[PDB]
Amino acid sequence: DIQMTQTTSSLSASLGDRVTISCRASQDISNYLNWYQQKPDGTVKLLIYYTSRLHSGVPSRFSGSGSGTDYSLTISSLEQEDVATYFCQQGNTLPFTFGSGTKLEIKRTVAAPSVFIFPPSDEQLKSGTASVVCLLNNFYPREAKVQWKVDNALQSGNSQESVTEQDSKDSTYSLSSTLTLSKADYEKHKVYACEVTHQGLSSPVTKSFNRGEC
Amino acid sequence: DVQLQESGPGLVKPSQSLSLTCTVTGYSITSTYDWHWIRHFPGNILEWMGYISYSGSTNYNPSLKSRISITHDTSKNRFFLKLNSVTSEDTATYYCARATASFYDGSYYFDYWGQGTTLTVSSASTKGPSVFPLAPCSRSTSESTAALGCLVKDYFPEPVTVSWNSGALTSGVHTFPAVLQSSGLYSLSSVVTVPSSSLGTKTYTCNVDHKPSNTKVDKRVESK
Amino acid sequence: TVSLWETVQKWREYRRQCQRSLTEDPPPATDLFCNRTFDEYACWPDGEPGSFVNVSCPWYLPWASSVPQGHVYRFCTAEGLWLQKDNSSLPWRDLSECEESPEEQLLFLY
């Protein structure tokens, strides 16, 4: 009943840089440690087996080391096609168990988001609900604070974010935040604003509208 | 060249039975190796389920107590996963894999994988999306670029495809991953950046398709 | 009950036992014996110079009951060398008695 832990679940590194992903087993697994790569489209490939043996066809940039309970996978120079999630797996004793994975992505220079806000369309309002949408376009890094304010009052519980996968060309992300209110609540207030805090912005950016001007 | 590929229903109702097939080509499943099922939950939990050997011997993860069977059809070189009375916790991507071994060091490892097949467990009914314009409050802006979109709301099951101007507009497009709402229905937005000068000289239409409901909808996006 | 995994576990146990023998068994009667070794297939004991050395069919093999009396053989020359062709980098070994090719090819893939 062996637990595999990959303490880091997410890592970003520059193209060309050395990458190390680490795994820890809850007990000694006697070098029976395998590494798998899962690409964004879902395809899974064996990289390394028995701690350090390279599966044929796998780039030599990949190597593995470790013993006892502690193991590591190393990418000697990060290339674009290595963007993927990496999983360890002990093959010492049943049941076979896997680590929780480390998602690897590209580190690039800071890029501030371009921010847009969209009011609910008249077409939606006659349906009974109101969706307010805030778009953060083409930014890096992923970390961003997005706050909703209705008549300058902060909102909780009633919004959802969605993020694109890292863009394969410029390495940026885009993000949507959707505030959901009932028609009645939407009509009860005037000023709708989304406020974005991000490394690329010297000070927070707010986009807003007045319900009446839509 | 060994290939494995999973097939089966992408959608199943709670308490029903799940049955998946792995079709193996390039190697006989009754020779030498063991043949495994592994699933990947959303949230990156990867769970080993069981194997059937070249001899027909099986071995299952104890957690999948009584619910699981693995069988094979050797004449068709296929093996099967049956999972009894699924619930929404069985929603996952299901992979079949070949296990081999080295008798130089005793290692045992999964050297070839299927592409995986996604499975969703849900009792929600099929429903086409409503499609709403995403347009700026003001139709006059001093900024060089502007963003347009459409909100694709309250559909089931996945997926929808969104295109812009029938595929002619592709650069600057972001179509976000769908989010499952509290209601059992999915929602997403698709957006595009365009030059501001292009507004009112050039038309922007988002074309949404939802095959499960046979929905095909075009929505012209303009600032009201 | 019959699987690649079960056989692997048995091989691992075979290796563990062999390693114990290699370390713990008392030194040979004289100075000249051929040296004990695990060749990843079978555990070889110290060999008497001028004698064939007989080792039971390794018990982890899936067909280890097709061949219960069987033996695999090496030869230890008068000079205390394991017999080995000039053409080869591995000692001569006759395992004809312990044969069952797909499983056997895998068995010898290093």
Coordinates of C-alpha atoms in Angstrom, one line a residue, chain A residues 1-118:
Chain A
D1 CA 0.0 0.0 0.0
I2 CA 2.8 2.4 -1.1
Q3 CA 2.2 6.1 -1.3
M4 CA 4.0 8.0 -4.1
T5 CA 4.4 11.7 -3.5
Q6 CA 5.5 14.3 -5.9
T7 CA 5.7 17.3 -3.6
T8 CA 5.9 19.7 -6.5
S9 CA 2.6 19.4 -8.6
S10 CA 3.6 22.3 -10.9
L11 CA 6.8 23.6 -12.3
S12 CA 7.8 26.2 -14.9
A13 CA 11.3 26.4 -16.5
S14 CA 13.0 28.3 -19.4
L15 CA 13.7 26.7 -22.7
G16 CA 17.1 25.1 -22.6
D17 CA 17.2 24.9 -18.8
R18 CA 17.8 21.8 -16.6
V19 CA 14.7 20.3 -15.0
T20 CA 14.4 18.0 -12.0
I21 CA 11.2 16.3 -10.9
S22 CA 11.3 14.4 -7.6
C23 CA 9.3 11.5 -6.2
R24 CA 9.2 10.0 -2.8
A25 CA 7.9 6.5 -1.8
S26 CA 6.3 5.8 1.6
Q27 CA 8.7 2.9 1.9
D28 CA 11.8 1.4 0.3
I29 CA 10.9 0.3 -3.3
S30 CA 14.3 -1.2 -4.2
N31 CA 14.8 0.9 -7.4
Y32 CA 11.6 -0.4 -9.0
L33 CA 10.6 3.1 -10.0
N34 CA 9.2 4.0 -13.4
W35 CA 8.6 7.4 -15.0
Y36 CA 5.8 8.3 -17.4
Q37 CA 5.1 11.3 -19.5
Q38 CA 1.5 12.4 -20.2
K39 CA 1.2 14.9 -23.0
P40 CA -1.6 17.6 -23.0
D41 CA -3.6 15.6 -25.6
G42 CA -3.5 12.6 -23.3
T43 CA -0.9 10.4 -24.9
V44 CA 1.2 8.5 -22.4
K45 CA 4.8 7.3 -22.9
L46 CA 7.2 5.3 -20.7
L47 CA 10.4 7.3 -20.3
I48 CA 12.5 5.5 -17.7
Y49 CA 12.1 2.2 -15.9
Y50 CA 14.1 0.7 -13.0
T51 CA 15.1 4.2 -11.8
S52 CA 17.5 5.0 -14.6
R53 CA 17.1 2.8 -17.7
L54 CA 16.0 4.8 -20.8
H55 CA 13.2 3.2 -22.8
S56 CA 14.3 2.9 -26.4
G57 CA 13.2 5.8 -28.6
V58 CA 13.2 8.2 -25.6
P59 CA 15.5 11.3 -26.0
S60 CA 18.8 11.0 -24.1
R61 CA 18.0 14.4 -22.5
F62 CA 16.0 12.3 -20.0
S63 CA 17.8 10.5 -17.1
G64 CA 16.7 9.1 -13.8
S65 CA 18.4 8.5 -10.4
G66 CA 17.6 7.6 -6.8
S67 CA 17.4 4.7 -4.3
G68 CA 15.5 3.7 -1.2
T69 CA 12.5 6.0 -1.0
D70 CA 13.8 9.0 -3.0
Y71 CA 14.0 9.3 -6.8
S72 CA 14.3 12.0 -9.4
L73 CA 13.7 12.5 -13.2
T74 CA 16.0 15.0 -14.9
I75 CA 15.6 16.8 -18.2
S76 CA 19.1 18.1 -19.2
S77 CA 17.7 20.8 -21.5
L78 CA 14.1 21.7 -21.6
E79 CA 12.5 21.7 -25.1
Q80 CA 9.0 22.7 -26.2
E81 CA 7.8 19.2 -26.8
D82 CA 8.6 18.3 -23.1
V83 CA 5.6 20.3 -21.9
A84 CA 3.7 17.5 -20.3
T85 CA 2.7 16.0 -16.9
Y86 CA 5.3 13.6 -15.4
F87 CA 4.2 10.7 -13.2
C88 CA 6.3 8.3 -11.1
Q89 CA 5.1 4.7 -10.4
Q90 CA 6.4 2.1 -8.0
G91 CA 6.6 -1.5 -9.4
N92 CA 7.8 -3.2 -6.3
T93 CA 4.6 -4.5 -4.9
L94 CA 0.8 -4.7 -5.6
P95 CA -1.2 -2.7 -5.9
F96 CA 0.9 -0.6 -8.3
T97 CA 0.7 3.0 -7.3
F98 CA 1.5 6.3 -9.1
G99 CA 2.6 9.7 -7.9
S100 CA 0.2 12.7 -8.2
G101 CA 2.2 14.1 -11.1
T102 CA 4.2 17.2 -11.9
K103 CA 2.9 19.5 -14.7
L104 CA 5.8 21.1 -16.6
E105 CA 5.4 24.3 -18.5
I106 CA 7.5 27.0 -20.2
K107 CA 8.8 30.0 -18.3
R108 CA 8.9 33.1 -20.4
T109 CA 9.4 36.8 -19.7
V110 CA 6.6 38.7 -17.9
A111 CA 3.6 39.7 -20.0
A112 CA 0.8 41.8 -18.6
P113 CA -2.8 40.7 -19.4
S114 CA -5.0 42.8 -21.7
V115 CA -8.3 43.1 -19.7
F116 CA -11.8 43.2 -21.1
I117 CA -15.2 43.2 -19.5
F118 CA -18.5 42.2 -21.2

